[PDB]
Amino acid sequence: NLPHEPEFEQAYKELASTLENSTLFQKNPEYRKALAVVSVPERVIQFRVVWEDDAGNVQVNRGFRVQFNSALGPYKGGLRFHPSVNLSILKFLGFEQIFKNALTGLNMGGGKGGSDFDPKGKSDNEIRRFCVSFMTELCKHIGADTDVPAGDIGVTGREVGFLFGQYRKIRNQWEGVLTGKGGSWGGSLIRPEATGYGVVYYVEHMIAHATNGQESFKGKRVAISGSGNVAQYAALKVIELGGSVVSLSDSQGSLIINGEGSFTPEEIELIAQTKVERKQLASIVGAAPFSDANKFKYIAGARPWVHVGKVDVALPSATQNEISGEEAQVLINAGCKFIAEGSNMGCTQEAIDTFEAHRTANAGAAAIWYAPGKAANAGGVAVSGLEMAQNSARLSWTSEEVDARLKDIMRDCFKNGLETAQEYATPAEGVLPSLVTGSNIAGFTKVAAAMKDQGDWW
Amino acid sequence: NLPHEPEFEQAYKELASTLENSTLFQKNPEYRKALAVVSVPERVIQFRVVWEDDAGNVQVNRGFRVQFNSALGPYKGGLRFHPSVNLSILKFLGFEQIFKNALTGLNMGGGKGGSDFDPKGKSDNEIRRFCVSFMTELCKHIGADTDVPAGDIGVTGREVGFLFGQYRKIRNQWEGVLTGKGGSWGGSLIRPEATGYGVVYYVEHMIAHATNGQESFKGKRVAISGSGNVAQYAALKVIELGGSVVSLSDSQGSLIINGEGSFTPEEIELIAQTKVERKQLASIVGAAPFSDANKFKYIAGARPWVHVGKVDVALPSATQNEISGEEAQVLINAGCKFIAEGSNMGCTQEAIDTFEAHRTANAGAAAIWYAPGKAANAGGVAVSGLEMAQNSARLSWTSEEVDARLKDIMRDCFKNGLETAQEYATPAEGVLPSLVTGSNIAGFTKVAAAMKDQGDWW
Amino acid sequence: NLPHEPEFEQAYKELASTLENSTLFQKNPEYRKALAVVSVPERVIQFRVVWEDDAGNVQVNRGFRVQFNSALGPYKGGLRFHPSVNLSILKFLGFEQIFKNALTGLNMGGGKGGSDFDPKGKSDNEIRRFCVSFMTELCKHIGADTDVPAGDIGVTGREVGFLFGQYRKIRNQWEGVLTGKGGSWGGSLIRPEATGYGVVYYVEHMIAHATNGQESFKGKRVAISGSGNVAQYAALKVIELGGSVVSLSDSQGSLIINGEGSFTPEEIELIAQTKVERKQLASIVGAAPFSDANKFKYIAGARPWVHVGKVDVALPSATQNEISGEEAQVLINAGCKFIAEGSNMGCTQEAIDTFEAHRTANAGAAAIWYAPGKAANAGGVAVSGLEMAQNSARLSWTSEEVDARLKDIMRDCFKNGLETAQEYATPAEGVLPSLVTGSNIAGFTKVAAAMKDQGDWW
Amino acid sequence: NLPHEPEFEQAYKELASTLENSTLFQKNPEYRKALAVVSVPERVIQFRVVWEDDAGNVQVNRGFRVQFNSALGPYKGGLRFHPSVNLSILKFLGFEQIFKNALTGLNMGGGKGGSDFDPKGKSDNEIRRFCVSFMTELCKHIGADTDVPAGDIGVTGREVGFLFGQYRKIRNQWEGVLTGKGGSWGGSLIRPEATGYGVVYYVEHMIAHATNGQESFKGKRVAISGSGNVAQYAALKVIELGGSVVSLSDSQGSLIINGEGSFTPEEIELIAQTKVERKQLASIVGAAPFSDANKFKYIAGARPWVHVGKVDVALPSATQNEISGEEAQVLINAGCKFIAEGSNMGCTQEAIDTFEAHRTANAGAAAIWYAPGKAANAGGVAVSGLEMAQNSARLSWTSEEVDARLKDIMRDCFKNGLETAQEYATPAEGVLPSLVTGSNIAGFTKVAAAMKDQGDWW
């Protein structure tokens, strides 16, 4: 009797739904067995972490590690430190990590770990104590050749340093077990920029194919939610390309541009360091230059999808399930045509159904196009794998080298989903193929073939 | 954001309530932190098990291992192979295992493992294949000095043999990691009968203290549910002592004696061998001697609590939460005075509340007395620990030697709960002390002191 | 080029000189190579221990572990947490542990560990933090079947509990790796008093052999130094036998008796918790019952050898090198006839030479007798080995059984030194044989034969 | 109570005094805590090695390994087989190894091991047997990803071959655990000449900066002590560059050129062959071409500092503390202006003070400049790290490639010390900055930042 895990259940149900409504099972009826095997995590570990705060009291926290599948390669996935982390969130993060790694083409598997520890409001000494205890508990199941952690929301370079400091005092090995570290001791360039660069390149390819390369981000208005590294760097890149960003959002409030205009790189940097100290967006809106009413408007507790009016590109990049069914209809009426997920699984099921129905009912560029999270978000993991290869080679790659492949990775990732959709889910004339269906089918076929060749199922 | 685990949540809430409604926290205000720490399992493992059935198809099952606490000693707990096994059930089994081991006074920690594999309807080859695949993955964390598996519902000597075969094939060590094995290769005598003998002895001590040793099982009618080894041997012991057993139960139906009388030892063996092949009780009621309508009445789908009439002792020993509030009221009206839990958490929370209220509202033997599951069910774990000691000594202990110790264990376990209840939860004059409160307080104080001396909390 | 290690160098020089001034090397000229090999520890480990105090500051300490020899069995020796602990002290402690274990006759090797951490003045949280940090580093080499530490000066049950907690958190094994633990979880009865009982029995045997059984502790005056467990329990036992203790001492001052009399069990008993909470003796003399000037005289900073006047037995039991030549002459003049070392290597080299010369120059009971520290101090290790055997058997021995055995060990230890001294160092008529020579030769011959049979030297 | 370790105490006192007399602690008062932590080795291991010589007699030697600090990476340091090796020498070698690795910029830490075994006068069978026993004892802690040994004084390729032969039999792994091996099985080119090339390049940069590039090694006289690989190759390189070498030295005596002239490469080459067989320099002065009294003068037991007359460059490269205060003044009077240490801590404390005072009291090139050993002798470890990277890449690098990099490291290492001294220890106008102060501050700041980011101290 399985427990209730809404996020993972919804993700798996969506994957099974887009697999069923195609010709995959008609051509390969034996692949239905692989779905049952691939949906059960290979190994899930939960451990109690007991640490001491500055006041000398005992604290209790839970640590998790989910290793979902390793058919393609060793385990990979960063540590997410957030108060909402439970088994379900890490499970679906690993589940989509599998296919995100499969689509990129790099030979490396998917997993995830983390905890419910909340860095916000915690002094340096307290997080040092927590990291020491956490790595003491976790050290029994880690290693660069068995699981590859990295950075994520809630974990910065300081926690990574403390984790590695405790790890070296038990196993006494120096290797690239963790990625996203400091550049001087195993990091890679463009890594903070890579996720946003990848999503922007993917949506650019989408636009080019949809309109036969007639327009681009120049002369367009893009809607962005969230203020994380991915959203901020995608906004910076689209500004550099020639686009106009119209809104940035945060969990408790959203800041929206007023009238026509776009954000400038200088104040975006100020937003960047604001989240570095994990502060509030409204804590800055009361001072210059965000005290200006004509350019910046702060609306606490409201998402930027309906207050923004006319837009062309939507990149929900803040949390999961951040677009409801009602928001989807409003986005259609606002003139939006292309949506990509900055963060994994950012749109609810009803919104996906609405976008798919609109795509099916309209031909040509008049139909809105959907980019699934496991496709456009794959840049960061690709560059992380390249960083792992570099640390294996013990060499440093320049900014231009790794920025060239990221362009190539996305063009291959887009084609792989598009071509597969045409053959397995061939649509009627004049309607663009389903990118979500193609991406899911491509990733699942790759993983299923690998598992079959390794004898996991038969 | 914790998931919904109804069984463990109910057990933890019950323990916390019975601790709060006493003077433990007034004398020792610092023990709240110990309660916070002790409620989180030390380590939980979930792994995918893939095995091949007789038809050559892929099968998928989940394996669990919950290691709850080791302050008192190394981990201990059998493997439960039932189709309903999930994380919550194993978690609450381990949680009560900790205190059950604490009350007996032996040095052993609390843990549990199992799977959702269903032995019923499975051939020998299929179950052997599953056992091989299961021990292949579990072997990465096991060992006699780290965790002690045993027997439980759903596991027999055959599964134990297959598990041991794969263990010795992988790690190549021979030691008593599993208890309850065959007597010739590490088992101990009286092991099947120990649980029933212990619960019956505890009830006997309960009667002696309540009525000043004026009556005993002889001349009384006892109500028993379930047909497991614990209930079967408990009924046999009541027959030997001189009581009357009136009912046996199964998951889908119950069989109840008609009028005055009691079961005979010869027919009890017929029920005993029937469950050996995991066959249904109704499959034997249609033939002699159970085809007699004058002695045996089969009521499928109904519990024997309200169809039995006048009773004196209730020993619910089939599943968890098998007595509701209405059932408790019917037992109160029927004249029953003494209840003990054959299985863990036999009665639902409302039933405990009703029994406690009736005990508080009445004085003397007119008040119904409640025996908690963690107290009267401790015989099996005690003899298992003695078996571990014997295997350490590489010697065999005779039937009479281990039967005397179990008599001494139960009288000490009963006294420990009774004396502690008087000092911490002293009632009004003429009212029997709360056995559940005393047992919970004794076990919790022992475990909390053991953890404090080891620095788990401070 | 060896460093300067005065204590170990002095002990090794004493052993070498004692062996040379006898016929061991004449009979077995090949044993010089064994003396060369045995003087080098098998393995010495030093590690930095970094721990955080209550104020949040960084603290640095050193951890040591010396495993001197293991020809007779696995390593054995407690952890000593004292400020003066450096490599030399632990080296000579392990060196004498070798032969102390050899004389007793049990099959267990010699070793020692500890640190320069200072428990005095430290709160419980600081001790827990240090113990966690210490057992994190030491865990890489420790185990019940490789090295078995115990209790010593500076370590009590609390540090044992914390160390065991961290050890079971890292290695996850429960076994009798540490001796001297709590009785409920691996301890043994009559363990704390065994050292004092053993030294008292040994000196009693010496007296009986010296005066042909015409005298005992009844009617004698015994001088004792120090206030440790050994000194306190030796005083208790000799009081029970019929002796009179006249002085206790401490590192900052000594308390001698005034005129004729002796301390009573109650005042000795209250001294125990005085040292348990680790407060200076002078903080107690100013109050009752030690405020009485008629019975107690506190001479701070002075040893009790000179101010005590006439004595019959001296048991220096405080620190190493606690008796110089002048004190030896004063003890000779005061009428003492038997010297036994409560602690390891209590008498300096010149004092030992003086006692030996006095023994050689006089015949019969007129010559005073010297007992080496490695002989009379062997009770504690013997009962600790018995405790190890009990934990192996997972059984507890009663107080009476361990008291009879401890009396049997001492009579064997005395004879072993006595008989060997006559064979190899036969003196002139009427002169008592050299106990130090006999004990050293017996221990060395046993260890050398064990090493030769194992191919360490050839 | 720390023991007397003169060499390590001298080095630590030098570093502490150098840091104190600057503004490092004024800008960062918190770094005083890091000094206490960094001065205690992480782990020190000593073991007894027993081996059989050619005559069948038992031989005993002591083995050591010191792993000082690993904040920057895994441990590194060769095995030194010299009869004078004890704990203090290896400790200070590792201590300066940490900072020598920090200044170079390669990311790998410091450590050291060795023994007191004396290869001189030992047949090949005896050293094979000793290496077999030594690597059997040391195998419990060694590994390429844990500690990286290399070559040093007393260790040639033959001992390395024997050690690797025994190590592969136990652990059974082939990787770059040892550096300085044969070029066909993991060695690197230029490796023997690397340290000499590095020191000569550093001093050439020093001369260029002091004289504004107006002077170089052409037309200068350089005084060199020692006849090891470093001194021999430095003399060869300066001869090729256009310099004039005037003296070589050995342990018991020194050979000094007579009048004006310089050594020729053919003579320098055969001295290396002389030291290959560990033969004596005086054994060669008695024959041609050293039988010529006009060019060569052998002065046994005398150092070449005061017998040489006018010199320009002094490169003491024989032992530690080979220049005392008296010879320090003579070097000033002889016209020397630049001193660089070939070996670690070539000059004593008084000589360092004299050079520093003379530098402070004079402006311009008239003041003598002192190059610390931890800066100029960094070439060998840099090329060893490059060799480790090559073995990781499993590729062979040409002679010219690695020779170009070694020129780059010295130019970077010089500015790093020079620039840091300018900012933290800014001198008066016209006074050259203190290279020793700058190098110490740079290395210590890098190591302290690494430790802080790793959470060793806080």
Automatic annotation (TrEMBL), chains A, B, C, D:
Binding sites annotated in the UniProt record for NADP(+): R80, K120, D152, G154, R191, T195, S227, N229, V230, S251, K275, N344
Binding residues for NADPH: R80, K120, G151, D152, G154, R191, T195, S227, N229, V230, S251, Q280, N344
Positions with a binding annotation for NAD(+): T195, N229
Annotated 2-oxoglutarate 1 binding sites: K76, G78, Q97, K100, K112, R191, N344, S384
GO cellular component labels: cytosol
Catalyzed reactions per annotation: L-glutamate + NADP(+) + H2O = 2-oxoglutarate + NH4(+) + NADPH + H(+)
Alphabetized CDD domains for the sequence: NAD_bind_2_Glu_DH (cd05313)
NCBIfam families: PRK09414.1 (NF006929)
Protein name (Swiss-Prot/TrEMBL): Glutamate dehydrogenase
Natural source organism: Aspergillus niger
